[PDB]
């Protein structure tokens, strides 16, 4: 089974989807970001996406890209992300790391998987790593018992979607009007792996719309904006999002 | 096909140079470009269309000129200049954009996007798009659009749109990132005309194949004028397109030295350089595994050079393979060394070189001193220095 | 091989009679160096060693032969005629002018001259001269009007990078025709070691013939290329006419071809009726100017009228004498093209073919489109694209509102 | 038959002196003021007056003449104003030739200009940019209307062109220029007995005296324009000094 298997299992048994919240390490600073990720656990986040700020995030929207620019300006390091994963685990949370692949290559693919597992991390979301280049990652993924969350797109060919879902473990990230549920149907037609959907969820009503067909609701840009206004707004927005996934 | 990568785009097998370090959202259009290229690569109608444009439109073949008045400054060696500066648009870049724009219309794409630094590749792309009737959008760093108003108007007169990128460091690196995001959203009707021999498969191979005509011509020309193969072939290396283009025909010649010269800026010891092989390290950047300038965590660091075309933190993966294989050596050339070669080429031969190309000339002078009298060195003069007259005038204090 | 001399002037430099066009309208103080240049040129024009040296420079250094490109996307605006562009814009330095300065600089070396002087309008020929003088180790001095030096700061530095010296002419109207007057005065004082590299097919004998010969390669190449690509001789060969060097260079190979129309297009500025123009043949009259009897813009007393044009290369009050002869003989027709017609063709060639032409060349392109409408579908017109327009981008951008305020 | 300026040099040679030849451009500062100055030259001892036709592109003219002819054309001077000046100089009892570039003459009409100049009392024509090779029309018109033809020779003139130029000249031959001027006069006098005028930037009485040793005529132009810019009293003063310089005894 997968490390996140039990997480989605207790979600389906409660007639709800999983709330998956993203936050970048080191925004506005490293201690403040860890305090915010701990707040996500307290406020009802099932899975945490701890993002590694990268200097050239091509797949990141403007809100997240400007927060990782600020975090890098503040001097965030890759090891700071593993410190946040350790803090989230001690607080009873469940955390995966989302990062571009070059920081992993610089760290060492086997060494990063080892230290990520040793910090309590459960998986790795790789937006710019396709299974065709994941030879080293697949080996370290199995050796250290880590989930590998690959991404699929509305433009994925049937041969590539099946191959990408076959290579995934834990859940499949489906990134993008009705193209999001159609993409989820293509995955569920070839495998029974949970599917996460993140299209810029913004309110409680939007979280329920995705939760009608997706196993996990991925929220990222909205949590960063809430954290900019303040920490109390983050737990308030996360509270509204936690109520939407149960509807 | 002897020096080509595998189906995944990897040079050297277990080393893994190149590949496709892109998101899945872009793999459909990349497989579409790879299938289209491998189909037209062997179509005679495509090769005939390209040859007609290269000859009648771009001015190929370019001449090989022996700069005899440079000899006394190159240790009495014999410097031959591959005159890519005489091409239409003024550089070797016209070779790449003619092949990709022809391919884009073979594919049915109606829109072409391209990155650019100070404007050379953007002007070349707009030139090819106007010629073939393609909607053209150029992405340019906001810092570059502010101080390159005439190159913007140049692309604008050619019928292309120009978008100033204000994200990131607002330069060439960030313009590529923005054309990437554009291509992800518009891959149905848009082709990305990349400007150098890097990026994901098949772009490092495809661009090299379009630049191969430089080396093929230069190898025939040097045997006709000198009676033998050269002792060395040198070129400047930014992303690597003009270097790999002239290097390729000589790869299997045992006596021919291949030296690429990269921008060292104020010096490699100062952190204000662009010497990717001298001071960089392997890593994944812009869709390929190659060398780049990065810090201890893998973050892209800023590059500095008085050249715009060599002001790039990365380098093509086939050059990283040739460096590992020991076939090509890569040496640094500083700003001062390049400008001394710039003015020397002006006073001795009447040729005003692109500041990028002057790095190759400067390295050729140093190499001619090493090899001695009578040594034959072919230098790829990638572009003309009309765009750089104002920069060079300030340097020598001819302005005021 | 030395090409024949069927259309040459007489020994005095006169076209079409011993009192015809051309000749030598110079002071006696200059006749010694002119007879020396004439004798040197007549010896070298038939020297295979000289023609081999020039061919070697034209091929490996200048980039010759230039291609002949059929601008298919212009046909719709040229009455469905077929426009072929002689791509002199692809020469080294970017214009046909390199053909002239290479031969004359080689000739200056053959004569033992160590110093070369030359005029320039907005900088094009001065850069060309300084280029050849750097290549052949000659000392170079460029004369340029004070109005043009202040307005062309980059071309001055371009010439200094090439090792040449620039002198600002602050006398007269301080432009092209006064730089020639200053270079002429320099030659009278330093003829012992100085060669005057004149920039067009005008001036006293032997310069109209010599400059024409160094540019005849354009027409020789084009006449072969047009037969290979079109299968027949063209219906018309056209070119822009300032002093006349690029026009006479492409015209010459087709003179004895009976059915090939020859049309030169001159700059009409704001219009020939507005007095702000440079249409020498259209609004000028015969007279002696800059050493030759030809056409020039002059008032009732014989004074030179200032000329105006949006292009700097066609901004010249006179024209070469061999063109005046070909006009009187009916071989070549000369028609005016305004600033707007040229800029309209400038932008059209940019959007349709990706070729940014010199504004001087845009006059020829504009006239080719008009000629295609007159000649109709299937007509074959060869256009001398005399130069590239990188120097004219700032002017064209202001014209089309691409710079704002 | 003798030239129009022939008897003038004969008389100057009999009085052991050289002819003083003064140049002034028509219309500087204005046309009446220049006519008054040309009249003053006759009153102050100028044997021959050179009436200059201002031309828009005068390459042989120095900076002093060039700025003066520029200002005269800005004032709207015409070619007919030069013929009127020749009339005034003839009326004042003087002798005037016209120095002019050839294009104004071509515009006016060569035979027509020779006729009208001869009617106005003109004696000859100085042609600085007309060599004998292009002078077929001018030779015919000078014989028709009995006008002297003053061509120019230079230090760099070849022996063949110098003899051809002297042979083609009537009246006097203009020698335009350290020791080049006396050597040039020696070359002309070695092949002909025609009078030779020397222009040498003459500016003082002592310079005119040096030239009068070997030349038949002393040609002063730039120094006269400079003096006229000061005023007529200064021009009369300078012309008297120059008239004293040409007289050797
Ligand atoms: N994920 C991701 C990355 N954000 C940046 C750094 F890796 C972004 C990126 C991805 C791809 C490219 C690319 C390119 F440069 C040229 C071509 Cl032809 C095709 C491409 F797909 C460029 C930047
Ligand atoms: N006299 C007299 C005239 N002052 C001006 C008008 F004609 C001056 C002049 C004389 C000669 C030339 C000339 C030239 F343009 C090119 C060459 Cl190659 C040789 C020349 F000698 C130019 C101007």
Tokens representing B360 are 């190759």
> Quick one: how far is CA A169 from the chain centroid?
13
Consecutive H or E run containing C153 = helix C153-161
Residues within 8 A of A (CB atoms), B 264-323 only: 281-285, 289, 294, 296-300
Closest chain D residue to the Cα of C21, Cα to Cα: D134
Active site residue A49: yes
C257 phi, psi to nearest 5 deg: -85, 115
Pocket-testing residue among B9, B19, B22, B37, ligand 1, by greatest number of atoms within 8 A of Cβ: B22
Segments of C160-200 assigned E as strands? 165-169, 194-196
Helix and strand tally (H, E) in chain B? 14, 14
Task: Find the distance separating the first CA and the last CA of chain D, reported in whole Å.
Answer: 30
Distance from the C101 Cα atom to the nearest Cα atom in chain B, whole angstroms: 12
- CB neighbours of B131 closer than 8 A, spacing ≥ 6? B53, B57, B101, C73, C353, C354
Which segments of chain B are extended strands (E)? 10-11, 17-21, 64-66, 78-83, 111-116, 135-141, 161-165, 190-192, 232-236, 257-263, 281-285, 287-292, 328-333, 376-381
Determination technique used: X-ray
| Interchain pair A56, B173: CB under 8 A | yes
Contacts of C367 (CB under 8 A, 6+ apart): C238, C240, C263, C265, C335, C337, C341
Taking Cα atoms as reference points, which of C106, C108, C291 lies closest to residue C193?
Answer: C108
The strand pairing partners of D24, in sequence order, are D51
Structure tokens given for D222: 């730039």
Question: Is 3.40.50.1100 the CATH classification of the domain at C15-62+98-215?
Answer: yes
Domains in chain C: boundaries? 15-62+98-215, 63-96+216-405
D248/B267 Cα distance (integer angstroms): 79
Chains interfacing with B (3 or more CB pairs < 8 Å): A, C
Query: Is residue B396 within 8 Å of B343, Cβ to Cβ?
Result: yes
* Residue whose pair of structure tokens reads 């813009």 in the numeric block: C297
Nearest-CA residue for ligand 1 atom 8 is A58
Cβ atoms of A17 and A214 within 8 Å: the answer is yes
CATH of domain C63-96+216-405: 3.40.50.1100
Q: Does the C-beta of D129 come closer than 6 Å to ligand 2? A: yes
DSSP codes joined into one string, B50-114 = HHHIIIIIS-PSPPEEE-GGGGGGTTT-EEEEEEGGGSGGGBTHHHHHHHHHHHHHHHT--EEEE
- Cβ of C204 closer than 6 Å to ligand 2, yes or no, is yes
- Rounded alpha-carbon distances, angstroms, from residue D88 to B64, C289, D91: 72, 31, 5
User: How many residue pairs bridge chain B and chain C with CB atoms within 8 Å of each other?
Assistant: 123
Fold for B59-92+212-400, please state it. Rossmann fold (3.40.50)
Write out the two tokens for D17: 């002196």
**Does residue B98 contact residue B54 with C-beta atoms inside 8 Å?**
yes
Burial D172-210 (b: 16+ CB within 10 A, else e): bbbbbbeeebbebbebbbeeeebbbbbbbebbeeebbbb
| Ligand 1 proximity of B194 Cβ (cutoff 6 Å) | yes
Name the residue with tokens 């050839």: D102
Given the residues C66, C88, C97, C182, the one annotated as active site: C97
Residues of chain B contacting residue C397, judged by C-beta atoms under 8 Å apart: 150, 153, 156-157
- Give the whole-angstrom CA distance, residue D187 versus residue D166: 10
Phi/psi at A92 (nearest 5 deg)?
A: 85, 15
Cis before D222 (ω within 30)? no
Residue B368 Rama label (left phi>0; alpha psi -120 to 50; beta):
alpha
Closest CA to B177 of B194, B156, B153, B161: B194
Quick one: fold of B11-58+94-211? Rossmann fold (3.40.50)
Quote the domain boundaries for residue D45: 1-249
Copy the structure tokens of residue D225: 């324009």
Contacts of B347 in chain C (CB under 8 A): 134, 161-163
- For residue D29, is the peptide bond before it cis, meaning its omega torsion is within 30 degrees of 0? yes
The reply to whether B11-58+94-211 and B59-92+212-400 are identical in fold is: yes
CA atoms within 13 A on the CB side of D90: 16
Quick check: C205 contacting D, CB < 8 Å?
no
Could you give the 3-state DSSP secondary structure of residue C231? coil
Is A86 labeled as catalytic in the residue annotation? Answer: no
CB-based contact, C230 to chain B, within 8 Å:
no
- In terms of residues, how long is chain B? 400
* Residue whose C-alpha is closest to residue B346's, from B389, B380, B387: B389
Full DSSP string of B330-343: EEEE-HHHHHHHHH
Distance CA B34, CA C98 (A): 43
The CATH number of residue D51's host domain is 3.20.20.70
Please give the structure tokens belonging to residue C288. Answer: 């002696």
Q: Are strands C285-289 and C194-196 parallel, antiparallel or unpaired?
A: unpaired
Nearest atom (ligand 2) to Cα of C289: 7
Ligand 2 lined by C198 (C-beta under 6 Å): yes
D176 within 8 A of D154, measured Cβ to Cβ? yes
Q: Which residues contact B356 (CB under 8 A, 6 or more apart)?
A: B236, B238, B263, B307, B308, B309, B310, B382, B383
For residues A97 and A85, give the distance between their C-alpha atoms in angstroms, rounded to a whole number.
8
Best interface-test mutation with A: which of B298, B302, B312 has the largest number of A CBs within 10 A?
B298
* 3-class SS of residue C160: helix
Report yes or no: B25 at the C interface, CB cutoff 8 Å. no
Q: How far apart are CA D175 and CA D214, in angstroms?
A: 12
Nearest beta carbon to residue B299 from set A72, A105, A150: A72
Count of positions (residues) in chain C: 405
The total number of structural domains in chain D stands at 1
Calpha distance D27→D75 (Å, rounded): 7
What is the spatial distance between Cα A47 and Cα A45, in angstroms, rounded to a whole number?
A: 6
Cα D15 from Cα D9, distance rounded (Å)? 10
């Amino acid at each position: 089974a997968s490390r996140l298997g039990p997480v989605f299992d207790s979600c389906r048994a409660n007639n709800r989807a999983a709330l998956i919240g993203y936050l970048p390490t080191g925004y506005p600073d490293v201690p403040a970001s860890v305090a915010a990720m701990t707040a996500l656990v307290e406020s009802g986040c099932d899975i945490i996406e701890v993002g590694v700020p990268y200097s050239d995030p091509g797949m990141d929207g403007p809100t997240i890209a400007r927060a990782t620019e600020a975090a890098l300006r503040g001097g965030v390091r890759v090891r700071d992300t593993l410190a946040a994963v350790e803090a989230i685990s001690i607080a009873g949370g469940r955390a995966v790391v989302m990062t571009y692949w070059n920081p992993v290559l610089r760290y060492g693919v086997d060494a990063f998987a080892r230290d990520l597992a040793a910090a309590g991390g459960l998986g790795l979301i790789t937006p710019d790593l396709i299974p065709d280049e994941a030879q080293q990652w697949l080996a370290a993924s199995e050796e250290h018992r880590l989930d590998r969350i690959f991404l699929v797109a509305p433009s994925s060919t049937p041969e590539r979607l099946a191959a990408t879902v076959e290579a995934s473990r834990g859940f499949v990230y489906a990134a993008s009007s009705q193209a999001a549920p159609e993409l989820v149907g293509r995955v569920k037609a070839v495998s029974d792996i949970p599917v996460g959907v993140g299209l810029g969820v913004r309110s409680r009503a939007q979280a329920a719309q995705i939760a009608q067909y997706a196993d996990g609701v991925i929220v990222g840009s909205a949590l960063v904006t809430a954290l900019t206004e303040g920490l109390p707004r983050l737990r308030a927005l996360t509270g509204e999002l936690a109520a939407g996934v149960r509807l | 096909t002897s020096h080509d990568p595998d189906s995944g785009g990897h040079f050297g097998g277990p080393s893994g140079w190149g590949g496709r370090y892109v998101p899945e959202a872009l793999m459909a259009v990349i497989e579409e470009v790879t299938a289209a290229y491998q189909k037209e690569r062997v179509s005679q109608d495509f090769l005939d269309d390209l040859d007609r444009l290269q000859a009648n439109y771009a001015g190929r073949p370019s001449p090989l000129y022996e700069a005899t008045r440079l000899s006394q400054h190159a240790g009495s060696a014999r410097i031959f200049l591959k005159r890519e500066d005489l091409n239409h648009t003024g550089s070797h870049k016209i070779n790449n954009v003619l092949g990709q724009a022809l391919l884009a219309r073979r594919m049915g794409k109606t829109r072409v996007i391209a990155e650019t630094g100070a404007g050379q590749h953007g002007v070349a792309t707009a030139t090819a798009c106007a010629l073939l009737g393609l909607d053209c959008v150029i992405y340019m760093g906001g810092i570059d659009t502010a101080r390159q108003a005439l190159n913007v108007a140049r692309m604008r007169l050619l019928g292309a749109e120009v978008v100033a990128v204000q994200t990131g460091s607002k330069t060439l690196k960030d313009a590529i990132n923005e054309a990437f995001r554009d291509w992800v959203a518009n891959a149905d009707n848009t082709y990305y005309c990349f400007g150098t021999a890097a990026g994901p498969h098949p772009f490092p191979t495809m661009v090299r194949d379009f630049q191969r005509i430089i080396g093929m011509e230069a190898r025939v020309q040097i045997q006709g004028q000198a009676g033998r193969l050269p002792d060395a072939v040198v070129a400047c290396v930014g992303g690597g397109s003009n270097a790999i283009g002239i290097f390729h025909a000589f790869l299997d010649d045992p006596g021919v030295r291949l030296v690429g010269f990269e921008a060292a800026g104020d010096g490699v010891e100062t952190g204000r350089h662009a010497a990717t092989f001298t001071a960089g390290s392997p890593g994944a950047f812009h869709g390929s595994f190659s060398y780049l300038l990065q810090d201890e965590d893998g973050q892209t660091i800023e590059s500095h050079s008085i050249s715009a075309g060599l002001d790039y933190p990365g380098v093509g993966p086939e050059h990283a393979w040739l460096k590992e294989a020991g076939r090509v050596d890569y040496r640094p050339i500083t700003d001062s060394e390049a400008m001394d070669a710039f003015g020397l080429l002006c006073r001795m031969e009447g040729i005003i070189p692109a500041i990028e190309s002057a790095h190759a000339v400067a390295g050729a002078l140093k190499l001619g001193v090493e090899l001695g009298r009578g040594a034959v060195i072919v230098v790829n003069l990638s572009g003309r220095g009309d765009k750089d007259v104002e920069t060079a005038a300030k340097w020598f204090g001819l302005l005021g």
